Every structure is written in C-alpha cells, then in structure tokens.
Amino acid sequence: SGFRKMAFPSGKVEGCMVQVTCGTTTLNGLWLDDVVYCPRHVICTSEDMLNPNYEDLLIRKSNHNFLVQAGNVQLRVIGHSMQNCVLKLKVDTANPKTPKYKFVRIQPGQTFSVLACYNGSPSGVYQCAMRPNFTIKGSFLNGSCGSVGFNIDYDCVSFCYMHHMELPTGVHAGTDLEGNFYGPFVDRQTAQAAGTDTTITVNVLAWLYAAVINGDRWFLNRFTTTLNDFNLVAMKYNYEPLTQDHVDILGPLSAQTGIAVLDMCASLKELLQNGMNGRTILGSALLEDEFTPFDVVRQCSGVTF
Amino acid sequence: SGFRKMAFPSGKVEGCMVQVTCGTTTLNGLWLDDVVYCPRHVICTSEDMLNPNYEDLLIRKSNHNFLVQAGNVQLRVIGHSMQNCVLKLKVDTANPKTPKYKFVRIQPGQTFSVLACYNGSPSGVYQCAMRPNFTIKGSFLNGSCGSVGFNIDYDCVSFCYMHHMELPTGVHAGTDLEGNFYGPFVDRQTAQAAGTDTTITVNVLAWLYAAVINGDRWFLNRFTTTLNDFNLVAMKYNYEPLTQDHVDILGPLSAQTGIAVLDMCASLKELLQNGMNGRTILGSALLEDEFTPFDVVRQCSGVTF
Ligand SMILES: O=C1N[C@]2(C[C@H](C3CCC3)C2)C(=O)N1c1cncc(F)c1
Ligand SMILES: O=C1N[C@]2(C[C@H](C3CCC3)C2)C(=O)N1c1cncc(F)c1
C-alpha cells in the first residue's frame, strides 16, 4: 500500500541521450538506431530567436557543423533533415542501447515520465500530465531542451514528448517526436497564449478510487448523482466534462472497490462544493489530477517492465 | 524553472536487480560485484512469521536452495552468510553492470530514490524522505521486498535502503545494506510502535526557498523572528527544532535569494499559524518536507550524473 507520483524506470531512455552542439548552443538529443532527434532551435543564435527563418539557418549548416557526443564518444553525422520542429541527424553507427520503441502523439490528460537532461547527461526523472491546454508543468532549466517524455509497456518505450521551451508564464511546451508541437505553440521567443486550462476529471476520480483502495475513505458520502448533474458542477469548477468513455475506463476501479462511478462523482461534487475542510487525501490537501485510471491500476497491481 | 519531486535516474540500479527464490517465497535482490543482497525473511514460511528463528531456518538451507535469476540467466551461489537482517549470497560471476557504489546509512530527514521492483523487474521510481521516526511513506505491494533506495553523486550510487516490510499502519520499514533496520523495527509479523513523527523543518525552509526561486512569493511577509521564538512555534506544530547547523546548510539558498534564514522562518511561522487560505506553493496546498537543501540546489542548478 501507499500511493506515490511514480515515474517509469529511466534506464532504457538514459542509454539514448546524447549532447548536440551547433555553433555555441548545446542541448540534448535522442539517439535511436542510426538517427539523432533534437529541437531545430539548436541552429539559432540570440539574433534569431524573435522569429528564426529555420529553412535559411539550416541551409548554412553542413553535417560536420552538428557535434554529437554520446557520453565520451563522438558520432559521425552523415545526413541532416528538418521535420516540423525537430532535426533528424543521420549518424554512421546504430545506437547499440536502442530499446524497442514507438513514437506516439498522446492525448491531453495522459501522463508520462520525463528524463530531465543537461549536456546529454540525465539529471532526474519525474511523472507529469499533458494539460488539457497542451502545456506541461515540468522542471526544466536552460540546457534541458531535447529532454524527452515517455511511457513503457513490457519492453517497449513509447516516446511522446520532446522539450522545446518555457513560455513567459513558466509552463513548458514541446513536440511529439515528429516535431509537431502540442498546442498552438511555435519555437520563437514570443509571448504565446496557452488559453484556458481545466482539471482532468477522470484522473481525479481515478485518484479518489486509489485513496479508497489505500483506506483514505472520509470523503465517501450517502449521495449519488447523474452524469448530467455532475457535468453542471464540473463546468462551474473548470473541470473537463465526464463522458461515458471516462465512466467505462473507470470500470475496473469501480469493480475493485464496489463504488459505482456516479457514487464516486457525488463524493467529488461534495468536495468541489465544500472543499476538503482542512483534511487530506493520500497526503494531498488538493484534488490530484495527474494519475490516469491506467496509472492507478498499474501502481495498485504492481506491473513491471 | 518549475519544481517537481524528482528521482535520480534509475538505470545504474536497474542493472543490479535480480529475483531471489527460497522455498515458495520470491522477492528482489541487489547484485553488486559477486554478492547478491536480499531480505533474510525470504527463508521464512507462514508458520514462521510471528517470530522466526532465522539462525535455525538458515541452517536448514544450502547454497543450492537459493535460486538467483538475472533476467533469464541463472547465477551459481557459492556461499551464503546472514548479516543482521540481510542475506549475502556469494555468486561465481561479478555483475558486469555493477556501477561505482557505496553503502551508506542515512540520517532521518535525508531523501533518496526508490526503485520499486517485483520478481526482480523494475516497476517505477520515486523520491522520498527517511521520516524522523525512521519509517518511509512509500508505495510497495506484496513482492516489493528487496527493492532499494539510493542517491547518485557523479558516477557513484550510494545504496541507503532495502525494503523489508509494511507495518500494520501501512507505512514502510527497512534496513541499510548491512541489514541494520532504520528505527526500532524487527523482521517479525507483530504490531510495532513507530515513534512520534515530526515535520522536517530544514526541508520545509529549503522548499520555501525553492518556491521564491520559482517566483511563488505570496507567502513572503513584513516580519522576522528569532531561532528561540520560531522553535516555540515549531514545538507547538510538531516540527523538528531548527539548529544553527540547519541555518548553516540553508546558507547557499539564503545567499542566492537574499532572504535571511530568520525572515524565511517568519514566513513559515505565519503559514503554520494561519494556514495557506486556499492558495498553493509550487502546486501544493500543504507545507512540503521531502526536499533537502541539497535537493533544492541540485534541481535549481541542473546537476547531472
Ligand atoms: O533553454 C532554453 N532555450 C529556449 C528555447 C528558446 C526559444 C526561442 C526559440 C524557442 C529559448 C527555452 O525556452 N529554454 C528553456 C526551456 N525550458 C526551461 C528553461 F528554463 C529554458
Ligand atoms: O511482501 C511482504 N511480505 C512481508 C515481509 C513479512 C514480515 C513478516 C516477516 C517480516 C511480511 C511484508 O511486509 N511485505 C510487504 C511489504 N511491503 C508492502 C506490502 F504490501 C507487503
């Protein structure tokens, strides 16, 4: 028992991290098979950052301008191409530490682990969610660009995120591994609206089920609700609407605890309307939305990779 | 910017995890050089667990009774000794993936990463603190015993914790890697009192500095305090007394921020006496005590391994 914000074991990803240098900029790349993936903004200078012409900047670069180092060993670059906001550097050696992997574009409200890296060296691992507004609330300093987010299933790493930048609000924005930003963002040093964020309701309900499984039960009540009544409350408190597809994915947790999904919704409604009254749930004094139903089941069933 | 509960990259530890089987019990072991370390309770059966005679149980066992498996490959056990609450199995093969490592006995209030494992396979990684009462608030299910806690400094893993048991209160107890329990605990299925716990004051102060660095500064105020006045408040709220040694280790965060340690103590006083209202500090509605001053500096300075 116990419930923690748990990240995937990072070893399979640690062996893919490289340093990429172009001019004076150093950031991280991801070495899979004979390709290194990194943010295209490695090719910019401070002059460029307001609105870089990435096509013109890349035309001035040759394979030998991209310095790629995997720990102490220098890789030989034999081609380069830009795909959306990522550069793909072809190297002459396949990464012998390449795991089984997939590139995936995740949905808002899904979670993933981030391996924060500086100069191609791993610093730390943490779990976070893709917000409904396609930002992430990470921990990234100057030099962390190219750090990646991922999930692991059996022996297969699903890469879903590459870090590109910090918005002036201090939240984080990045791309899938085909270089398509999540959300409206562009790789330019400009103020950029994220637009309205919301609480991931299905995740809050999964976490309440996690709390009951761990014996934190004070918020259970004598009430029930409807999906329509609940969604009226959700809209008032800037929660995502709950759909039957959300109810369906909560089924295993409903079955385990014996608490019907709409009964757990009535508990959540009362927490939204009344607050916690200075009480905690799983060590938190607010409602936690960064655990998916899959996360809760995995942590509660002890699945390994 | 941003502040997350960050674990160390787990790859160096993942390469040391094995499965150990004695009779019908399977748990995790740690394979370093030519020794596998695991909880000695692997040799108990259900009849034994109220008060095992570990000396008599281990006498009934021979080298060939300890099945040690690293992924698919079987290790040959050529010796066995019990050291306190750990078993040490000498194997005929040095682990080729052994990192540079140390065994260290940590102090209460220190933090470490836990690699939670089942059947010798890594499940997840999280950060946590050794509580002042020598428990840990982890996430561990049946089969997680032998999971380890560690810190990394440069290329060196310092192993500080091996998981042994869940107390009836659902908090966790375990040993250093010499098999000495943290706290008063014994490897017996008995109700066992954990001391009174306290909040780790020096860590809360470190986290308030982390909050200012990240620009959450609403809790800063016009007040100051003294070490004696603060410590009268600390005792009323079951906070550890703050010592000059604590003030000294906050020195770098005081210098970085220009906020005198006793000013930061007067912010914490007001938070203890008034609560947060319904505001948050680094995404938390309570005062966080699982970041050390060292942790905050590392995360705020971007140190790698
Ligand atoms: O290291 C960089 N450099 C850019 C990328 C660059 C902008 C202008 C082209 C896109 C400015 C950035 O946003 N960060 C950063 C990221 N994450 C946390 C941080 F603290 C900084
Ligand atoms: O898997 C075991 N088995 C014992 C060890 C064993 C006690 C009685 C001899 C020492 C009973 C245990 O406490 N757990 C466990 C640990 N952590 C989280 C869990 F949910 C269970």
mmCIF file of N, CA and C in Angstrom, chain A residues 106-187:
data_model
loop_
_atom_site.group_PDB
_atom_site.id
_atom_site.type_symbol
_atom_site.label_atom_id
_atom_site.label_comp_id
_atom_site.label_asym_id
_atom_site.label_seq_id
_atom_site.Cartn_x
_atom_site.Cartn_y
_atom_site.Cartn_z
ATOM 1 N N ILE A 106 0.387 11.740 -27.764
ATOM 2 C CA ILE A 106 -0.536 11.464 -26.634
ATOM 3 C C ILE A 106 -1.664 12.459 -26.632
ATOM 4 N N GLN A 107 -2.706 12.076 -25.909
ATOM 5 C CA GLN A 107 -3.900 12.923 -25.764
ATOM 6 C C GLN A 107 -3.732 13.776 -24.515
ATOM 7 N N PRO A 108 -4.355 14.972 -24.495
ATOM 8 C CA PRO A 108 -4.395 15.781 -23.286
ATOM 9 C C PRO A 108 -5.001 14.937 -22.162
ATOM 10 N N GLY A 109 -4.436 15.048 -20.966
ATOM 11 C CA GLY A 109 -4.871 14.346 -19.750
ATOM 12 C C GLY A 109 -4.146 13.036 -19.568
ATOM 13 N N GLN A 110 -3.370 12.601 -20.572
ATOM 14 C CA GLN A 110 -2.483 11.421 -20.424
ATOM 15 C C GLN A 110 -1.213 11.839 -19.674
ATOM 16 N N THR A 111 -0.560 10.869 -19.038
ATOM 17 C CA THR A 111 0.623 11.106 -18.198
ATOM 18 C C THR A 111 1.825 10.458 -18.881
ATOM 19 N N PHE A 112 3.013 10.879 -18.467
ATOM 20 C CA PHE A 112 4.266 10.304 -18.996
ATOM 21 C C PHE A 112 5.379 10.713 -18.047
ATOM 22 N N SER A 113 6.507 10.006 -18.158
ATOM 23 C CA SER A 113 7.699 10.293 -17.359
ATOM 24 C C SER A 113 8.615 11.150 -18.199
ATOM 25 N N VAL A 114 9.306 12.048 -17.531
ATOM 26 C CA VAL A 114 10.291 12.931 -18.196
ATOM 27 C C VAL A 114 11.642 12.573 -17.639
ATOM 28 N N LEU A 115 12.618 12.386 -18.508
ATOM 29 C CA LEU A 115 14.020 12.288 -18.071
ATOM 30 C C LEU A 115 14.676 13.637 -18.329
ATOM 31 N N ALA A 116 14.798 14.485 -17.323
ATOM 32 C CA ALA A 116 15.443 15.807 -17.464
ATOM 33 C C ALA A 116 16.939 15.569 -17.662
ATOM 34 N N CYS A 117 17.504 16.162 -18.683
ATOM 35 C CA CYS A 117 18.919 16.032 -19.082
ATOM 36 C C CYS A 117 19.527 17.410 -19.350
ATOM 37 N N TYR A 118 20.829 17.528 -19.080
ATOM 38 C CA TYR A 118 21.685 18.699 -19.403
ATOM 39 C C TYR A 118 22.984 18.166 -20.026
ATOM 40 N N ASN A 119 23.384 18.758 -21.148
ATOM 41 C CA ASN A 119 24.624 18.342 -21.859
ATOM 42 C C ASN A 119 24.617 16.829 -22.135
ATOM 43 N N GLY A 120 23.459 16.217 -22.449
ATOM 44 C CA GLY A 120 23.358 14.785 -22.762
ATOM 45 C C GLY A 120 23.486 13.868 -21.549
ATOM 46 N N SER A 121 23.500 14.416 -20.326
ATOM 47 C CA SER A 121 23.598 13.650 -19.056
ATOM 48 C C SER A 121 22.302 13.752 -18.255
ATOM 49 N N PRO A 122 21.701 12.589 -17.942
ATOM 50 C CA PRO A 122 20.477 12.563 -17.134
ATOM 51 C C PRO A 122 20.647 13.162 -15.737
ATOM 52 N N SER A 123 19.677 13.967 -15.326
ATOM 53 C CA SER A 123 19.697 14.721 -14.048
ATOM 54 C C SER A 123 18.647 14.082 -13.121
ATOM 55 N N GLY A 124 17.489 13.747 -13.661
ATOM 56 C CA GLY A 124 16.369 13.309 -12.818
ATOM 57 C C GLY A 124 15.180 12.867 -13.628
ATOM 58 N N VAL A 125 14.300 12.142 -12.969
ATOM 59 C CA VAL A 125 13.107 11.572 -13.609
ATOM 60 C C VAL A 125 11.888 11.938 -12.773
ATOM 61 N N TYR A 126 10.838 12.381 -13.443
ATOM 62 C CA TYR A 126 9.556 12.680 -12.752
ATOM 63 C C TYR A 126 8.386 12.404 -13.675
ATOM 64 N N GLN A 127 7.210 12.293 -13.059
ATOM 65 C CA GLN A 127 5.956 11.993 -13.778
ATOM 66 C C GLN A 127 5.213 13.299 -14.001
ATOM 67 N N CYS A 128 4.577 13.492 -15.154
ATOM 68 C CA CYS A 128 3.617 14.624 -15.243
ATOM 69 C C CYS A 128 2.530 14.328 -16.256
ATOM 70 N N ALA A 129 1.574 15.238 -16.364
ATOM 71 C CA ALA A 129 0.452 15.072 -17.311
ATOM 72 C C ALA A 129 0.575 16.092 -18.433
ATOM 73 N N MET A 130 0.070 15.727 -19.594
ATOM 74 C CA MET A 130 -0.210 16.700 -20.663
ATOM 75 C C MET A 130 -1.466 17.452 -20.208
ATOM 76 N N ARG A 131 -1.370 18.731 -19.903
ATOM 77 C CA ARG A 131 -2.569 19.515 -19.500
ATOM 78 C C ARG A 131 -3.583 19.554 -20.639
ATOM 79 N N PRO A 132 -4.887 19.763 -20.305
ATOM 80 C CA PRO A 132 -5.890 19.998 -21.342
ATOM 81 C C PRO A 132 -5.515 21.088 -22.347
ATOM 82 N N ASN A 133 -4.681 22.035 -21.940
ATOM 83 C CA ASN A 133 -4.274 23.171 -22.818
ATOM 84 C C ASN A 133 -2.930 22.859 -23.493
ATOM 85 N N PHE A 134 -2.453 21.621 -23.365
ATOM 86 C CA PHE A 134 -1.285 21.088 -24.112
ATOM 87 C C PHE A 134 0.007 21.746 -23.627
ATOM 88 N N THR A 135 0.020 22.258 -22.414
ATOM 89 C CA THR A 135 1.267 22.618 -21.720
ATOM 90 C C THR A 135 1.616 21.488 -20.768
ATOM 91 N N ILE A 136 2.838 21.510 -20.271
ATOM 92 C CA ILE A 136 3.219 20.625 -19.151
ATOM 93 C C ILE A 136 3.825 21.506 -18.059
ATOM 94 N N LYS A 137 3.623 21.104 -16.822
ATOM 95 C CA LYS A 137 4.167 21.787 -15.630
ATOM 96 C C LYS A 137 5.375 20.979 -15.179
ATOM 97 N N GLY A 138 6.505 21.210 -15.821
ATOM 98 C CA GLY A 138 7.715 20.429 -15.586
ATOM 99 C C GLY A 138 8.684 21.121 -14.677
ATOM 100 N N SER A 139 9.884 20.587 -14.693
ATOM 101 C CA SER A 139 11.094 21.143 -14.058
ATOM 102 C C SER A 139 12.202 21.067 -15.092
ATOM 103 N N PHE A 140 12.488 22.204 -15.714
ATOM 104 C CA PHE A 140 13.401 22.307 -16.872
ATOM 105 C C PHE A 140 14.141 23.623 -16.718
ATOM 106 N N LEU A 141 15.454 23.553 -16.763
ATOM 107 C CA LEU A 141 16.330 24.740 -16.726
ATOM 108 C C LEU A 141 16.877 24.956 -18.123
ATOM 109 N N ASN A 142 17.535 26.095 -18.298
ATOM 110 C CA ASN A 142 18.295 26.359 -19.536
ATOM 111 C C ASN A 142 19.231 25.163 -19.762
ATOM 112 N N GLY A 143 19.232 24.619 -20.970
ATOM 113 C CA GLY A 143 20.039 23.444 -21.307
ATOM 114 C C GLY A 143 19.210 22.162 -21.363
ATOM 115 N N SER A 144 17.993 22.148 -20.832
ATOM 116 C CA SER A 144 17.148 20.914 -20.797
ATOM 117 C C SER A 144 16.457 20.620 -22.132
ATOM 118 N N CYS A 145 16.495 21.542 -23.104
ATOM 119 C CA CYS A 145 15.814 21.300 -24.400
ATOM 120 C C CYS A 145 16.292 19.986 -25.011
ATOM 121 N N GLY A 146 15.343 19.221 -25.578
ATOM 122 C CA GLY A 146 15.640 17.898 -26.123
ATOM 123 C C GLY A 146 15.427 16.803 -25.106
ATOM 124 N N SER A 147 15.202 17.121 -23.818
ATOM 125 C CA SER A 147 14.830 16.096 -22.819
ATOM 126 C C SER A 147 13.514 15.482 -23.317
ATOM 127 N N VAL A 148 13.249 14.226 -23.022
ATOM 128 C CA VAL A 148 12.059 13.557 -23.614
ATOM 129 C C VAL A 148 11.152 13.006 -22.525
ATOM 130 N N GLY A 149 9.900 12.839 -22.915
ATOM 131 C CA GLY A 149 8.907 12.144 -22.098
ATOM 132 C C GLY A 149 8.452 10.873 -22.774
ATOM 133 N N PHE A 150 8.054 9.914 -21.977
ATOM 134 C CA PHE A 150 7.864 8.544 -22.476
ATOM 135 C C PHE A 150 7.003 7.767 -21.500
ATOM 136 N N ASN A 151 6.457 6.685 -22.024
ATOM 137 C CA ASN A 151 5.787 5.612 -21.243
ATOM 138 C C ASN A 151 6.482 4.313 -21.618
ATOM 139 N N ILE A 152 6.395 3.317 -20.765
ATOM 140 C CA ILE A 152 6.966 1.983 -21.094
ATOM 141 C C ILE A 152 5.871 0.949 -20.886
ATOM 142 N N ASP A 153 5.718 0.048 -21.859
ATOM 143 C CA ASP A 153 4.779 -1.109 -21.813
ATOM 144 C C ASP A 153 5.580 -2.363 -22.182
ATOM 145 N N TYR A 154 5.714 -3.291 -21.231
ATOM 146 C CA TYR A 154 6.566 -4.501 -21.352
ATOM 147 C C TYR A 154 8.005 -4.041 -21.604
ATOM 148 N N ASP A 155 8.521 -4.232 -22.813
ATOM 149 C CA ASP A 155 9.937 -3.892 -23.107
ATOM 150 C C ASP A 155 9.982 -2.697 -24.071
ATOM 151 N N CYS A 156 8.830 -2.080 -24.337
ATOM 152 C CA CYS A 156 8.670 -1.078 -25.421
ATOM 153 C C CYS A 156 8.505 0.336 -24.858
ATOM 154 N N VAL A 157 9.401 1.224 -25.277
ATOM 155 C CA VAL A 157 9.366 2.637 -24.825
ATOM 156 C C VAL A 157 8.543 3.392 -25.854
ATOM 157 N N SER A 158 7.452 4.037 -25.423
ATOM 158 C CA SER A 158 6.654 4.919 -26.313
ATOM 159 C C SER A 158 7.093 6.360 -26.025
ATOM 160 N N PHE A 159 7.874 6.952 -26.922
ATOM 161 C CA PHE A 159 8.302 8.367 -26.782
ATOM 162 C C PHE A 159 7.145 9.255 -27.199
ATOM 163 N N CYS A 160 6.722 10.184 -26.349
ATOM 164 C CA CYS A 160 5.588 11.052 -26.672
ATOM 165 C C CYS A 160 5.948 12.531 -26.638
ATOM 166 N N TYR A 161 7.073 12.936 -26.057
ATOM 167 C CA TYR A 161 7.318 14.374 -25.820
ATOM 168 C C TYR A 161 8.801 14.645 -25.981
ATOM 169 N N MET A 162 9.116 15.762 -26.614
ATOM 170 C CA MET A 162 10.478 16.341 -26.601
ATOM 171 C C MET A 162 10.348 17.801 -26.170
ATOM 172 N N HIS A 163 11.149 18.203 -25.200
ATOM 173 C CA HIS A 163 11.014 19.549 -24.621
ATOM 174 C C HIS A 163 11.614 20.599 -25.533
ATOM 175 N N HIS A 164 10.872 21.678 -25.803
ATOM 176 C CA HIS A 164 11.395 22.782 -26.637
ATOM 177 C C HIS A 164 11.499 24.085 -25.897
ATOM 178 N N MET A 165 10.558 24.440 -25.042
ATOM 179 C CA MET A 165 10.723 25.788 -24.463
ATOM 180 C C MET A 165 9.834 26.055 -23.264
ATOM 181 N N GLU A 166 10.222 27.120 -22.579
ATOM 182 C CA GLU A 166 9.481 27.641 -21.420
ATOM 183 C C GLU A 166 8.773 28.900 -21.903
ATOM 184 N N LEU A 167 7.465 28.960 -21.696
ATOM 185 C CA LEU A 167 6.648 30.151 -22.027
ATOM 186 C C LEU A 167 6.916 31.210 -20.981
ATOM 187 N N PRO A 168 6.603 32.506 -21.222
ATOM 188 C CA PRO A 168 6.871 33.524 -20.206
ATOM 189 C C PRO A 168 6.099 33.329 -18.894
ATOM 190 N N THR A 169 5.043 32.517 -18.912
ATOM 191 C CA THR A 169 4.277 32.125 -17.701
ATOM 192 C C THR A 169 5.009 31.060 -16.892
ATOM 193 N N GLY A 170 6.067 30.471 -17.428
ATOM 194 C CA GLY A 170 6.858 29.495 -16.652
ATOM 195 C C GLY A 170 6.353 28.059 -16.811
ATOM 196 N N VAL A 171 5.395 27.831 -17.693
ATOM 197 C CA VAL A 171 4.982 26.444 -18.049
ATOM 198 C C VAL A 171 5.737 26.049 -19.318
ATOM 199 N N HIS A 172 5.639 24.785 -19.665
ATOM 200 C CA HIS A 172 6.539 24.160 -20.651
ATOM 201 C C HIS A 172 5.771 23.699 -21.887
ATOM 202 N N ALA A 173 6.436 23.764 -23.033
ATOM 203 C CA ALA A 173 5.838 23.414 -24.323
ATOM 204 C C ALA A 173 6.850 22.617 -25.127
ATOM 205 N N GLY A 174 6.327 21.705 -25.927
ATOM 206 C CA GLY A 174 7.189 20.835 -26.731
ATOM 207 C C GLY A 174 6.379 20.066 -27.743
ATOM 208 N N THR A 175 7.031 19.095 -28.375
ATOM 209 C CA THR A 175 6.558 18.445 -29.590
ATOM 210 C C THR A 175 6.429 16.940 -29.361
ATOM 211 N N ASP A 176 5.741 16.304 -30.276
ATOM 212 C CA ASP A 176 5.890 14.829 -30.387
ATOM 213 C C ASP A 176 7.246 14.584 -31.077
ATOM 214 N N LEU A 177 7.541 13.328 -31.355
ATOM 215 C CA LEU A 177 8.872 13.033 -31.936
ATOM 216 C C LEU A 177 8.881 13.193 -33.456
ATOM 217 N N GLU A 178 7.752 13.548 -34.088
ATOM 218 C CA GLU A 178 7.749 14.014 -35.490
ATOM 219 C C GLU A 178 7.882 15.537 -35.513
ATOM 220 N N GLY A 179 8.116 16.183 -34.369
ATOM 221 C CA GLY A 179 8.346 17.631 -34.326
ATOM 222 C C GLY A 179 7.107 18.508 -34.404
ATOM 223 N N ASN A 180 5.916 17.952 -34.205
ATOM 224 C CA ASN A 180 4.660 18.721 -34.153
ATOM 225 C C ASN A 180 4.413 19.176 -32.733
ATOM 226 N N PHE A 181 4.347 20.497 -32.500
ATOM 227 C CA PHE A 181 4.009 20.989 -31.157
ATOM 228 C C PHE A 181 2.683 20.386 -30.690
ATOM 229 N N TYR A 182 2.633 20.097 -29.414
ATOM 230 C CA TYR A 182 1.379 20.029 -28.656
ATOM 231 C C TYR A 182 0.885 21.445 -28.446
ATOM 232 N N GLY A 183 -0.358 21.678 -28.820
ATOM 233 C CA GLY A 183 -0.941 23.010 -28.632
ATOM 234 C C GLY A 183 -0.513 23.989 -29.702
ATOM 235 N N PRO A 184 -0.903 25.259 -29.519
ATOM 236 C CA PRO A 184 -0.739 26.282 -30.555
ATOM 237 C C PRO A 184 0.676 26.844 -30.709
ATOM 238 N N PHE A 185 1.622 26.302 -29.955
ATOM 239 C CA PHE A 185 2.912 26.972 -29.712
ATOM 240 C C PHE A 185 3.786 26.896 -30.958
ATOM 241 N N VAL A 186 4.683 27.879 -31.037
ATOM 242 C CA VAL A 186 5.738 27.932 -32.084
ATOM 243 C C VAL A 186 7.102 28.127 -31.426
ATOM 244 N N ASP A 187 8.167 27.637 -32.070
ATOM 245 C CA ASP A 187 9.529 27.764 -31.498
ATOM 246 C C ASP A 187 10.136 29.131 -31.848
#
